[PDB]
Design a protein around this nucleic acid. Structure first.
Ligand SMILES: [Mg+2]
Ligand SMILES: [Zn+2]
Ligand SMILES: [Zn+2]
Ligand SMILES: [Zn+2]
Lengths: 268, 171, 107, 93, 551, 84, 156
RNA sequence: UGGGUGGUGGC
């Protein structure tokens, strides 16, 4: 059935004729082995939990950075020039929370298979850079904000500069940038993890390189791998399930044996 | 009849030739292989134009053999004769069955039955010739003939002429 | 369709990446209707002639090959195997040249 | 080296290995084609080195190929059933 | 090097031009007209020219060269023949499409019963697909009952006004029913094929273009065979029954039967003929041409052999699991394989497979004689073909084979730069490794060579999970590359360390099996203590241990 | 007719593993057929290790012709593409 | 072996076969009129090309027997030497000055344009005989063409 | 160094 399907050098999915099937491979451009199930932390929990973990406040003293972890802590409190940065970024994350809450992952089950797992890189830098201490750091909040925002435009899946390229770029890695901002927000980094500058720059460079190395390769005969890797649990496997249900779904019957409805009722 | 023809030659290069003078080798190779050869399809390839500037392109590596395939495009002066075409010539030999005339690259045979009757082969004459009274066809005589048949050996082409028509003969 | 496949595979605890099921459910609706997996699906495509002949009913479909003057440019895979060619994928999805650019950089 | 072995070779994709398997350790076989009527009717004398597409009087538009002997067998069987596989070596449209 | 040199340059096939064949082009491609039913002269040593085994077709004997191509049997592809049937016949494989075509058009002038006047037909004309074009014309013409003399002042399109008949199919024999007038005698009569040939020769190229054909490729007077070709005898070569007598292939028996019915056709029109003696011998001719291409036709009994078995047609040589495609082209048998029964061996890496010595002796690999491998390869000559590690052949730069069981003088042989030498299967080469049947993309994986006596295949036991092999007697094959190219192909893609993670379920599918697993769980329970002395050995076993014990 | 300039190049600038495989095979086949090596030869005398010693340094005189599925093609040199 | 851009011969009827059609195509696909060469044109191209190739081989530093030795191989030496001597003894306009004059005079099928220059003629009667294609074209001056051609023709 | 049928056994 599939034996010619080849992902070419434009991230699309054609047969021998050129019947394009998916405009972007697997809807993401990501090689199928290269995922782990991770936790997009900004889905679950209450508004209290989010507003307690993330909401920066630079006017009130105590809800700000407890000043033991940063060197420059004299240079901060009250400045609205940096408060508007952080309000924009908190509204950014409320936008992402509404996004991943109400568009994509509606029922809120947050565990999803998503590529390169950053937490492991963070704790790898931690064990490399001896990251206890419980020590002041010299890495500023505006460098965090500009690092995240200058990250989210460097995850080129679909390269080039036409309008549909940039549109398909932002359609492509919305969920992955949502992941990064779901983790590497300012209060989480500078309280719960306690990086320094050099760790953070290494984190930025490595997320670059490995989300480059988990792009799908061109010519991965995905139909063939796909067909085998669906046939393989079919080897070792009141509604009909198993092999006849699979047969009917493939050979498409107008008469399957026992059809069914999923009928919701209205909320009242 | 001379033409300028746009031709090309496929050259396959063995990997031991994958060296710093590869393109110049291919240009010399084209000339050695194409100049002076004859085909019934184009004729004699007399000389190649602009030989030292020929663009040999890039060699495609043949899967499974390692060797590289170049398509060397070029433009040459070619000479092909045609049935019906009138041309001048220089007679090379005269014999009892007619004479042979050099028209550039090749040689044309004119038989006695395609020579007007008043031209009589005279062996006693020095030098031997076909003679009349005001006509004289000996070796080295400029003659104007008409190509009445072209035969192809793909190596050398063979053309038979005639001076048995108007305005054809010695000049 | 996707919900059906993910159901009946993952009933017995077995787990499947999204993109494989996605590729299957999108090829099954390439052409606006369910191009089902039989001879009726693939052979009633206008694709490569020998590729369609290599699956089923090869006598009839060869007679319809020669019977209507088809032009198969042989970009299907099965053609390029049975015509003994560099098939178009893997290493053979793309030719390799020699380079006058880098061999000019070379001495 | 059956079907589903070729299937997993396609899945790995390294088809150059497949062109080793179904050409070179098997019935490697060499035929000729006249480039006009596209067929393999071209009679091959070699030490005299001459050829003739006798349905065409074609003596120049001649190429050889490298196909499996069973593929040639397919072609002779089909032409003995009157279907005409014609192999043109260039894309036409 | 494996082929003799030619001057026509190698090119690969790009475009299959499927099409039909004229009677003309059959008559223009062959070398011999076919005449005589006997094979032999008079049983006299070189059988009869004019029978079926013409040496101008291509000789199926090793020692008599071909009398058209002038080669041996190794190089001659064969040459077509053709047997001029006196009576033209149907091709057996087009009878529904020929049925539809004589459903379409006039039977006097041969013109399509619709034009661009009827606008739904005028819309169906615009279709770029030939097949559903012919479907739409086939649909709109099956209701049209009368050949319009007029255009569908007389605008006489070409028809005469006589009606158009109703086309039934009955096996080989067609029954057209005109409504010859309203009601009068319907002449349901056998559509003789020659009458339809004379019909089909009267078609305009526009009616070819509208009706789903193409003129220079598929002209629908070519779907009736006047001249049924003869294949060369490679396709039906004689088999040594018991090493003196040749039982023939069934194509030879069937072409003999066709030529016998051919001569018994031409016997009737040259003498007194009782008019259905004609009909039966003609219908028998059609029967023999039918079973030449197909012995599976519905409704009629099969063509039968001289054992009580059915005849091997051309259709039976192509369909089925063991036809030429699925049994010989899509998949086939090949060489440089090997095969045995396996055994586990945990004293190994993960990319190593044990090789019995005799299998290393039999198979080989052509390593190129280069400037960096002369010495060992000369030594592998000096082992010869009965001593591993060694060699079996030198292929020269031209194609010279030197079998070193049949050569006294290995000691006087220098080698040249760029010759070819097949040495044996030495250590550290890629092999492919493989178990029938393949079920996922790890089921072929590359490995490296380890040479062991005691003839079985050795494995690691972590690779037991992906191939799904136990050790109650499985067979696992071993294909060998014969080139440098495929070696690197295997070594960079199909090697085990690059196929650990299966995209089936985005997890590793090569883990730990029975003993190593339950042992390590017994080892690192909390209350397990080891003395220092045994620990010395235990940390010696790690190939990646630095040289430092823990505290 | 088809070919694109080397500035509109919108395909990925990496070698990927399939490309890598063919480059290794073909370069090794050439150096098997006595094409001299641009890199030093320590113990790596088998041709595949020679090829990986070159690709380690990106010293390969080849050109990928990726057939983009119109028919046109981006002539990538090896030298420009980022070795993985 | 060697092939061209294009993918019963009677010179009297201007039937030159499939290779020498009126409209040719160069190696870029551009349309181009057939390039038929008179004996005089051909003498200039061949001699120029041969001495230009010799100069390029010498990094940038006359006789036909010497000029034909520029070719590679005894077969090529032969065809080129035999062609130059033929052109040396039948090219009327043996310099580019006269040749461009003949070029402008003539610039009508490309085959005829080369024949009129190659074949010296006296009158219109001799031209329409040897070149029977000029019959139905109906636009002479032919005579002053031949007169100018014969006047431009240098002595020997 | 036969074909072609058919039977039993291995995973
Ligand atoms: Mg078992
Ligand atoms: Zn032909
Ligand atoms: Zn022969
Ligand atoms: Zn009628």
């Amino acid at each position: 059935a599939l034996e010619d399907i080849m992902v070419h050098y434009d991230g699309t999915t054609r047969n021998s004729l050129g019947d394009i099937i998916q405009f972007l491979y697997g809807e993401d451009g990501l090689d199928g082995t290269q995922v782990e199930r991770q936790t997009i932390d900004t889905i679950p929990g209450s508004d209290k939990a989010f507003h307690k973990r993330y909401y920066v406040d630079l006017m009130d003293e105590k809800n700000s950075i407890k000043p033991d972890v940063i060197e420059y802590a004299a240079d901060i409190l009250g400045d609205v020039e940096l408060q508007k940065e952080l309000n924009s970024e908190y509204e950014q994350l409320v936008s992402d929370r509404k996004f991943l809450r109400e568009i994509v992952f509606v029922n809120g089950d947050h565990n999803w298979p998503l590529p390169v797992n950053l937490r492991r890189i963070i704790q790898n830098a931690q064990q490399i850079f001896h990251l206890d201490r419980a020590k002041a750091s010299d890495l500023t909040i505006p460098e965090i904000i500009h690092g995240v925002r200058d990250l989210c435009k460097k995850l080129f899946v679909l390269r080039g500069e036409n309008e549909l390229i940039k549109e398909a770029q932002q359609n492509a890695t919305s969920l992955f940038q949502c992941l990064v901002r779901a983790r590497l927000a300012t209060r989480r980094i500078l309280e719960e993890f306690r990086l320094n500058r050099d760790a953070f720059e290494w984190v930025l460079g490595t997320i670059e390189a490995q989300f480059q190395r988990s792009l799908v390769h061109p010519g991965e005969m995905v139909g063939v791998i796909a067909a085998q890797s669906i046939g393989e649990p079919a080897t070792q496997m009141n509604v009909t399930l198993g092999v006849p249900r699979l047969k009917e779904i493939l050979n498409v019957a107008k008469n399957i044996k026992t059809p069914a409805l999923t009928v919701y009722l209205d909320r009242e | 009849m001379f033409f300028l023809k746009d031709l090309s030659l496929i050259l396959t290069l063995h990997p031991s030739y994958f060296g710093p003078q590869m393109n110049q080798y291919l240009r010399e190779k084209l000339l050695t292989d194409v100049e002076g050869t004859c085909t019934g399809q184009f004729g004699y390839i007399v000389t190649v134009l602009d030989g030292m500037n020929i663009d040999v392109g890039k060699g495609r590596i043949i899967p499974g053999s390692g060797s590289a395939e170049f398509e060397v495009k070029y433009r040459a002066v070619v000479w092909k004769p045609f049935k019906g075409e009138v041309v001048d010539a220089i007679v090379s030999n005269v014999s009892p069955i007619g004479f042979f005339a050099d028209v550039g690259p090749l040689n044309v045979f004119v038989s006695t039955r395609l020579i007007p009757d008043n031209l009589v082969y005279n062996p006693s004459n020095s030098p031997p010739a076909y003679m009349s009274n005001d006509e004289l066809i000996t070796k080295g005589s400029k003659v104007r003939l008409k190509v009445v048949g072209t035969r192809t050996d793909v190596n050398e082409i063979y053309a038979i002429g005639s001076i048995k028509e108007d305005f054809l003969g010695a000049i | 369709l996707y919900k059906e496949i993910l159901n009946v595979i993952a009933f017995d605890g077995s787990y499947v990446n999204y993109r494989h099921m996605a590729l299957l459910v999108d090829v099954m609706t390439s052409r606006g209707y369910l191009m089902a997996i039989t001879r009726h699906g693939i052979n009633r495509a206008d694709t490569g002639a020998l590729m369609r002949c290599s699956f089923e009913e090869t006598v009839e479909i060869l007679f319809e090959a020669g019977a209507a003057a088809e032009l198969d440019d042989c970009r299907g895979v099965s053609e390029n195997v049975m015509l003994g060619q560099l098939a178009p994928m893997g290493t053979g999805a793309f030719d390799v040249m020699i380079d006058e650019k880098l061999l000019t950089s070379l001495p | 080296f059956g079907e589903m072995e070729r299937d997993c070779m396609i899945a790995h994709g390294a088809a150059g290995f497949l062109k080793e398997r179904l050409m070179e350790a098997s019935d490697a076989f060499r035929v000729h084609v006249c480039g006009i009527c596209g067929l393999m009717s071209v009679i091959a004398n070699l030490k005299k080195n001459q050829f003739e597409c006798r349905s065409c009087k074609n003596k120049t538009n001649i190429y050889q190929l490298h196909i499996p002997y069973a593929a040639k067998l397919l072609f002779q069987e089909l032409m003995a059933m009157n279907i005409a596989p014609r192999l043109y070596t260039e894309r036409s449209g | 090097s494996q082929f003799p040199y030619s001057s026509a340059p190698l090119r690969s096939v790009k475009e299959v031009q499927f099409g039909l064949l004229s009677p003309e082009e059959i008559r223009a491609i062959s070398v011999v007209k076919i005449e005589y039913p006997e094979i032999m002269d008079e049983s006299r040593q070189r059988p009869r020219e004019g029978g079926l085994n013409d040496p101008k077709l291509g000789s199926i004997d090793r020692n008599f060269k071909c009398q058209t191509c002038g080669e041996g049997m190794a190089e001659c592809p064969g040459h077509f023949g053709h047997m001029e049937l006196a009576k033209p016949v149907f091709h057996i494989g087009f009878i529904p499409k020929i049925k539809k075509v004589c459903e379409c058009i006039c039977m006097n002038c041969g013109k399509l019963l619709l034009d661009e006047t009827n606008p739904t037909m005028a819309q169906a004309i615009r279709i770029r697909d030939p097949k559903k074009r012919f479907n739409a014309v086939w649909q709109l013409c099956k209701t049209k009952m009368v050949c319009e003399a007029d255009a569908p002042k007389v605008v006489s399109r070409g028809g005469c006004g006589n009606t158009q008949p109703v086309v039934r199919k009955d096996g080989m024999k067609l029954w057209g029913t005109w409504k010859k007038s309203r009601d009068a005698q319907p002449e349901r009569k056998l559509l003789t094929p020659g009458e339809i040939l004379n019909v089909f020769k009267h078609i305009s190229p526009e009616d070819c273009f509208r009706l789903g054909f193409n003129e220079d490729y598929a002209r629908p007077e070519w779907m009736i065979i006047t001249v049924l070709p003869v294949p060369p005898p490679q396709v039906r070569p004689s088999i040594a029954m018991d090493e003196t007598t040749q039982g023939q292939d069934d194509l030879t028996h069937k072409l003999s039967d066709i030529l016998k019915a051919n001569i018994n056709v031409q016997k009737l029109e040259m003498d007194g003929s009782p008019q259905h003696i004609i009909n039966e011998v003609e219908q028998l001719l059609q029967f023999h041409v039918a079973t030449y291409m197909d012995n599976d036709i519905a409704g009629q009994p099969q063509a039968l052999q001289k054992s009580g078995r059915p005849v091997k047609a051309i259709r039976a040589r192509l369909k089925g699991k063991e036809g030429r495609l699925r049994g010989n082209l899509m998949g086939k048998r090949v060489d440089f394989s090997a095969r045995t029964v396996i055994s586990g061996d945990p004293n190994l890496e993960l990319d190593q497979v044990g090789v019995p010595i005799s299998i290393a002796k039999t198979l080989s690999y052509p390593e190129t004689v280069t400037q960096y491998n002369i010495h060992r390869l000369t030594e592998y000559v000096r082992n010869g073909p009965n001593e591993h590690p060694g060699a079996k052949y030198v292929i020269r730069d031209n194609g010279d084979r030197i079998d070193l069981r049949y050569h006294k003088r290995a000691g006087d042989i220098v080698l040249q730069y760029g010759w070819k030498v097949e040495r044996h299967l030495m250590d550290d080469d890629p092999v492919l490794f493989n178990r029938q049947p393949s079920l996922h993309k790890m089921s072929m994986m590359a490995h490296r060579v380890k040479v062991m006596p005691y003839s079985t295949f050795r494995l690691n036991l972590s690779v037991t999970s992906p191939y799904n092999a136990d050790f109650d007697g499985d067979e696992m094959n071993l294909h060998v590359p014969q080139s440098e190219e495929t070696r690197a192909e295997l070594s960079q893609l199909c090697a085990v360390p690059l196929q650990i993670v299966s995209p089936q379920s985005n997890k590793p599918v090569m883990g730990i099996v029975q003993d190593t697993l339950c042992g390590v769980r017994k080892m690192t329970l909390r209350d397990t203590f080891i003395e220092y002395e045994q620990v010395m050995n235990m940390l010696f076993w790690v190939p990646s241990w630095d040289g430092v014990v823990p505290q | 007719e088809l070919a694109i300039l080397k500035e509109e190049r919108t395909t990925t600038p990496y070698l990927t593993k399939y490309e890598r495989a063919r480059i290794l095979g073909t370069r090794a086949l050439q150096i098997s057929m006595n094409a001299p090596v641009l890199v030093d030869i320590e113990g790596e005398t088998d041709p595949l290790q020679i090829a990986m010693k070159e690709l380690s340094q990106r010293k390969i005189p080849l050109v990928i012709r990726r057939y983009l599925p119109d028919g046109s093609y981006e002539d990538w040199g090896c030298d420009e593409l980022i070795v993985d | 072996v060697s092939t061209s851009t294009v993918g019963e011969e009677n010179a009297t009827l201007l039937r030159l076969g499939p290779e020498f059609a009126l409209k040719q195509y160069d190696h870029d696909g551009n349309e181009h009129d057939l390039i038929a060469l008179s004996l005089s044109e051909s003498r200039l191209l061949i001699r120029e090309a041969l001495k230009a190739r010799s100069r390029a081989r010498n990094g940038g530093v006359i006789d036909d027997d010497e000029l034909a030795k520029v070719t590679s191989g005894a077969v090529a030496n032969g065809v080129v030497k035999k062609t130059l001597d033929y052109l040396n003894t039948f090219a009327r306009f043996k310099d580019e000055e006269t040749c461009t004059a003949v070029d402008q005079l003539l610039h009508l099928h490309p085959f005829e344009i080369a024949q009129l220059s190659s074949l010296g003629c006296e009158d219109v009667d001799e031209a329409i005989t040897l070149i029977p294609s000029l019959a139905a074209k109906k636009e002479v001056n032919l005579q002053r063409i031949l007169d100018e051609l014969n006047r431009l023709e240098d002595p020997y």
